[PDB]
């Protein structure tokens, strides 16, 4: 099985609170390093996702604030396949691409 070894590498993170989320499901074509902007307290990660079923390229940004959120964000590499649920953040009004916060995510590498 090609996907047999991918099961042992699953990493799942979730929140027990339920908000309105944007669901992304696909491969990570390109992911950059992390930037610290709000007084070196947050983490900014630009993501390029090739979705599933349409194979279109979308660009998003991810924000991390806690230690566990940064740990979950650090698991995303190139060619990683993700089922990510992201809460929209109101800072996208000053951004070219939307800024999101990880609510639930499942990561396989």
């Amino acid at each position: 099985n090609i996907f047999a070894n991918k099961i042992a590498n699953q990493k799942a993170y979730f929140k027990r609170d339920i908000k309105t989320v944007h669901t992304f499901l696909g491969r990570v074509n390109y992911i950059q390093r992390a930037s610290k902007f709000n007084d070196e307290k947050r983490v900014f990660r630009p993501l390029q996702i090739e979705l599933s079923g349409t194979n279109e390229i979308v660009d998003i940004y991810l924000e991390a604030t806690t230690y566990i959120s940064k740990k979950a964000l650090d698991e995303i590499r190139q060619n990683s396949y993700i089922f990510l649920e992201a809460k929209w953040l109101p800072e996208s009004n000053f951004l070219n691409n939307p800024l999101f916060e990880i609510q639930n995510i499942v990561i396989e590498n």
Partner: protein, 203 residues
């Protein structure tokens, strides 16, 4: 023969269903290659269907599959997702003999190791009938199962009976079984050749 194929292809009436029955990935490769951007729905049934299932990560066990093309098969599944239909209910067989079929009460999509994927289950044909219930064109280019054994020859006959209740069939073995069934009149056009008709329909 030319008029019916030209009407079905150049003047198609959507929605359109193209069930290509084949036990070889290469066998219908060209036919499918002709319907990736020229069809609304494509159905894969046969040994190449189990090749596609192998490309899906679902264990095939004793069921054969064209390994040398498996990656290409997966690529097809990557290119078109809604445009592909695969069976979900599998009736396994102890061997290649004419023994009674074996089904799975729970998780029938999974083939146990040691058995061979033999027949299409009632759930898959029920889904096929439910989908084909709204379809102006129902093509065909090959058999939907093995007919050398009676216990596993019911799939194509059931599919033909459901479809008859346009209806164009041009399979090498499907046409003969349809004629032996007695529903030839209901079909809009039953071609006299299987390989030639599929090659003409490819382009």
């Amino acid at each position: 023969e030319i008029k019916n194929l030209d009407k079905a292809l150049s003047r198609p009436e959507r929605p359109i269903v193209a069930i290509l029955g084949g036990a070889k990935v290469s066998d219908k490769i060209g036919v499918l290659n002709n319907l990736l951007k020229y069809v609304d729905k494509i159905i894969i049934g046969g040994a190449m269907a189990y090749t596609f299932l192998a490309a899906q990560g679902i264990g095939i066990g004793k069921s054969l599959v064209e390994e040398d093309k498996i990656d290409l098969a997966r690529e097809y599944l990557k290119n078109n997702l809604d445009k592909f239909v695969l069976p979900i209910d599998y009736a396994l067989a102890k061997d290649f003999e004419d023994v009674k079929p074996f089904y799975n009460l729970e998780n029938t999509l999974e083939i146990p190791n040691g058995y061979m994927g033999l027949d299409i289950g009632p759930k898959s044909i029920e889904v096929f009938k439910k989908y084909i219930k709204d379809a102006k064109t129902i093509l065909w280019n090959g058999p939907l199962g093995v007919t050398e054994f009676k216990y596993f020859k019911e799939g194509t006959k059931a599919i033909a009976k459901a479809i008859t209740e346009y209806t164009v069939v041009g399979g090498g073995d499907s046409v003969a079984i349809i004629e032996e069934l007695g529903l030839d009149r209901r079909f809009s056009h039953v071609s006299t050749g299987g390989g030639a008709t599929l090659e003409f329909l490819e382009g």
